[PDB]
Amino acid sequence: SFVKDFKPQALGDTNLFKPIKIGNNELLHRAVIPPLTRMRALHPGNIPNRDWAVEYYTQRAQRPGTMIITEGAFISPQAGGYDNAPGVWSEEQMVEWTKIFNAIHEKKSFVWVNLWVLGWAAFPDNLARDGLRYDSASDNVFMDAEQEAKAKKANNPQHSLTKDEIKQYIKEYVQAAKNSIAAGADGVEIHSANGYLLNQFLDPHSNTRTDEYGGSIENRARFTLEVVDALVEAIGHEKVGLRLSPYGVFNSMSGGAETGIVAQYAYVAGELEKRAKAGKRLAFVHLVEPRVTNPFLTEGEGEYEGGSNDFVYSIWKGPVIRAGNFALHPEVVREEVKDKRTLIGYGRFFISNPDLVDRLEKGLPLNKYDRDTFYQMSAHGYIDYPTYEEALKLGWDKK
Numbered sequence: 001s002f003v004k005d006f007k008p009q010a011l012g013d014t015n016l017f018k019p020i021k022i023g024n025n026e027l028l029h030r031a032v033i034p035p036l037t038r039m040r041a042l043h044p045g046n047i048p049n050r051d052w053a054v055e056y057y058t059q060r061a062q063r064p065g066t067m068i069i070t071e072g073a074f075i076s077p078q079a080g081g082y083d084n085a086p087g088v089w090s091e092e093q094m095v096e097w098t099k100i101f102n103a104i105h106e107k108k109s110f111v112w113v114n115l116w117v118l119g120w121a122a123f124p125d126n127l128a129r130d131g132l133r134y135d136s137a138s139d140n141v142f143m144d145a146e147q148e149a150k151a152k153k154a155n156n157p158q159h160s161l162t163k164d165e166i167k168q169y170i171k172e173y174v175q176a177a178k179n180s181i182a183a184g185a186d187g188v189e190i191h192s193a194n195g196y197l198l199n200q201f202l203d204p205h206s207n208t209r210t211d212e213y214g215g216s217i218e219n220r221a222r223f224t225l226e227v228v229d230a231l232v233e234a235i236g237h238e239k240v241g242l243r244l245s246p247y248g249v250f251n252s253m254s255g256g257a258e259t260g261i262v263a264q265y266a267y268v269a270g271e272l273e274k275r276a277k278a279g280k281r282l283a284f285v286h287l288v289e290p291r292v293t294n295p296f297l298t299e300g301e302g303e304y305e306g307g308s309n310d311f312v313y314s315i316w317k318g319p320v321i322r323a324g325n326f327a328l329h330p331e332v333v334r335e336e337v338k339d340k341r342t343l344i345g346y347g348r349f350f351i352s353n354p355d356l357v358d359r360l361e362k363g364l365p366l367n368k369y370d371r372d373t374f375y376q377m378s379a380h381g382y383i384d385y386p387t388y389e390e391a392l393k394l395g396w397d398k399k
């Protein structure tokens, strides 16, 4: 079952296949695997699937020199909220993560742990059960209707983080980052996009605070930057990444509707480039394409014609990973990669194609992804996707 009506194009002759260096890693191509939640972690314990996780990542580390940003990992119990998402706070979890990283490194690929904190995107009932607060930037604005419904049902109102709680969250980022490197992770990517906690602070719609963590560009960017400054000093700026989704409106973020959103983000990028001067330039900056403001929806629905991230290029001088609907558009990838410091993140199709990189370099048919197994406790739709050879022998081309 390959994708029809799609005319592939060999990209082997573009820079997509030219070696670049990110942090301490020396990639052999520039097609990256962005953080993809698959929800196969175990419960209780948010334990990395002791059965399929290793095989899954291994299958996608097959192409040597692949930079793999793992699926979102909770830094601690409070930062979580989804029973089947993995974490990087306990020993039990670190024992399973170490096995995955060795599988990845063994295939001569790299791995970067994405540090995840759901904020208001977390299920409140799940938090009330473990005795956890329902965190967020404020208490008078909720994600949406179904959420303020669960918040009340479990009498777990949306709590507005105080100063000491952010510091506690910042203590956990350093520990999650440390444990990650301790086990052989090539680095860590601070997840500050798609409407999760940090993003909830960056966004003016979700951030109605008055203190130094709200009330202005400077203040709404305070949290994310303290985390940046925290992990940089603890593990080394060459082991830290940052993800942002300027025009994303996922998890009820402002997006391009807010006029000063571009200022909110140009500020952040400038501060990175600032530290980039003190000799402390984060390994990279990962951006979710405006083309994709909602990670969870059809392939084409939800974009912005009056907004682009090309502005970050005018401020940030380090590498840039751009992610969002690129597999079925090699014409756009061919052009976007003429920039010597731009990598490309493929999500949906790395899920369906374990040997994606080879299929880009040669212009071969892409495996269709099954939307129903994105988040499912199963191997089917997780690790049984065929490689180009396996798909052929199976007559996937419908002869």
Ligand SMILES: Cc1cc2nc3c(=O)[nH]c(=O)nc-3n(C[C@H](O)[C@H](O)[C@H](O)COP(=O)(O)O)c2cc1C
Binding pocket: 034, 035, 036, 037, 038, 071, 072, 191, 193, 194, 288, 292, 295, 323, 324, 325, 326, 327, 345, 346, 347, 348, 349, 374, 375
């Ligand atoms: C099943 C699935 C899970 C995802 N999980 C996450 C996540 O945990 N964090 C995140 O920031 N983005 C997440 N994304 C968005 C991806 O990082 C990526 O930006 C998105 O797939 C857009 O690229 P694509 O259109 O080429 O797939 C997810 C996407 C999918 C399809």
Ligand SMILES: [Mg+2]
Binding pocket: 392, 393, 394, 395
């Ligand atoms: Mg045959």
